[PDB]
Amino acid sequence: SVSIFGLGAMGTALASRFLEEKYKVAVWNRSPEKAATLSHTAVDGINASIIICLLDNAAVEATLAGALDHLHGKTIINLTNGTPDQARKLSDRFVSHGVHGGIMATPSMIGSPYALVLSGSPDAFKLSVLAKCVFLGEDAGTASLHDLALLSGMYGLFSGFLHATALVRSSTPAVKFMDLLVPWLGAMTEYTKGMAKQIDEGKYTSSNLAMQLVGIQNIIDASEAQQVSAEFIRPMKEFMQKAVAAGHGGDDISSLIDFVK
Amino acid sequence: MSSVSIFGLGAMGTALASRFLEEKYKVAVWNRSPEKASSLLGKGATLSHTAVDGINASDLIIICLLDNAAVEATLAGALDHLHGKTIINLTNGTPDQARKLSDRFVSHGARYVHGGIMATPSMIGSPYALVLYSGSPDAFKAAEGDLSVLAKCVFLGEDAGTASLHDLALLSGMYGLFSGFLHATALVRSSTPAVKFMDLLVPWLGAMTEYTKGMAKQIDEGKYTSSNLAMQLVGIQNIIDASEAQQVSAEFIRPMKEFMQKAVAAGHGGDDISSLIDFVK
Ligand SMILES: NC(=O)c1ccc[n+]([C@@H]2O[C@H](COP(=O)([O-])OP(=O)(O)OC[C@H]3O[C@@H](n4cnc5c(N)ncnc54)[C@H](OP(=O)(O)O)[C@@H]3O)[C@@H](O)[C@H]2O)c1
């Protein structure tokens, strides 16, 4: 038996999957619309069986407030994306009354092979139907740090996609352009493997920051001419400028790592 | 047996020049500074003393410099000796720089084509080397044979600046990727090491790279139907708050945030991240 809170795109995908493996799923929402046992209140859903999955951790505190009374005995798995510190404040608040997972998966991928979920009380932890489990510490907010990090790299990628598509829209359609992007991103995703190595040791040895700078300026000039915003690339430019100024004129794009603090 | 004449001996024009030698060509070479950027005729190259001597060295001319300004500057040389030649400018630049050059050089009897080298120097000659070419397709067809030694040719229009548009676009998406890598690494370094972290990033980016295929489709038709911009916004705010707490800069993500804020405000609260395409324009 499990009892879910939050029936958005992700909490439903999760709830649906627990059903397909024949579980006793209890479910709750602010605004109900289910397909399961429906918890009329948060108290009735707390006493049902606990996989929370909401908009923020504020919503976690807000919703579970009323149910101060029956927390004693339960094992709260918060899948809600958030900060490490939010997660630690919640873990201490809830352990005072008797974990965390970053779902590295879109809803459609839940139950799929490529689904993955990243911390907290390892007694309670010791889910697998949903995705490939990956525990990594008794630190209640370690999963959240790894969530946000991975998302940071995602959001880099989408920022490039959007800029790249936008910049070419006039001349060709986006799909016919994926014929060139998708391989190229593949190449460039490889080059980041041979950059984490540099970052881990401290090489940064030369495709030089001086020429890339005059390159990035050609994208900005070209973006304005195509009526596209180059605001996706500005931080990259600001960081390469810190680098050549600080002496890395002839060093690799790895060198910027020390200028992002 | 087949003769080429290069201009510009930086990291890229040397890689190119070196490769033409390894396929036993009659490679002529030129630079601003020869005594600087090596003119090792040792591997067989012929040093053009002036731009004129390098223009007359061959009828295939592969330029590759810092900017197009350097292209115009160097070839100025009252370019009367240009009639008959096939100028391949691999110099990264704007579509409009490329069109201004193509008209300038076609006025002097030459036949211009332009190329975005989608390849670092070490990749030149390799399987994954790729070069986009646009410009006079008459000139490109004749010299497609020779150029093919360097990378996989990919022609796409008689528009002298189409290769440059595709160059800068692809680079824009590269720079997005590195911006995410650096931010993502940075944010995690002080809890776990960058290499052990590529074990999670590299697959995940693979997933997310697939999702961009089914997003170009949306962008091409006009769906944007829901993974919603309202929740991602409170997500992106958690990365900014988390970055400050780890003493890391969240400056890589700010434009994304500014764009999602334009989107939910303009009504796309429940739409997919595809919807943002119309808010970069
Ligand atoms: N979708 C993805 O691709 C994806 C992937 C990985 C992780 N995630 C994570 O999943 C979390 C939820 O996923 P989602 O995509 O399902 O977002 P979602 O559909 O918006 O989930 C939000 C849920 O929380 C409830 N809620 C919203 N505001 C509330 C409030 N003020 N008080 C109480 N309850 C509230 C909603 O129900 P009511 O509106 O009825 O209250 C809704 O069911 C996200 O924050 C994100 O961390 C999403």
Ligand SMILES: NC(=O)c1ccc[n+]([C@@H]2O[C@H](COP(=O)([O-])OP(=O)(O)OC[C@H]3O[C@@H](n4cnc5c(N)ncnc54)[C@H](OP(=O)(O)O)[C@@H]3O)[C@@H](O)[C@H]2O)c1
């Ligand atoms: N390396 C890569 O990863 C890569 C990848 C794709 C495309 N590219 C492009 O290939 C081209 C060259 O790249 P690179 O890495 O060789 O650049 P680099 O490291 O700066 O090479 C500099 C080259 O530009 C010349 N130059 C500078 N100012 C000039 C002027 N006023 N007149 C004539 N020549 C001038 C230099 O001459 P000196 O010898 O006197 O400096 C030298 O030939 C650029 O357009 C670059 O954007 C490079």
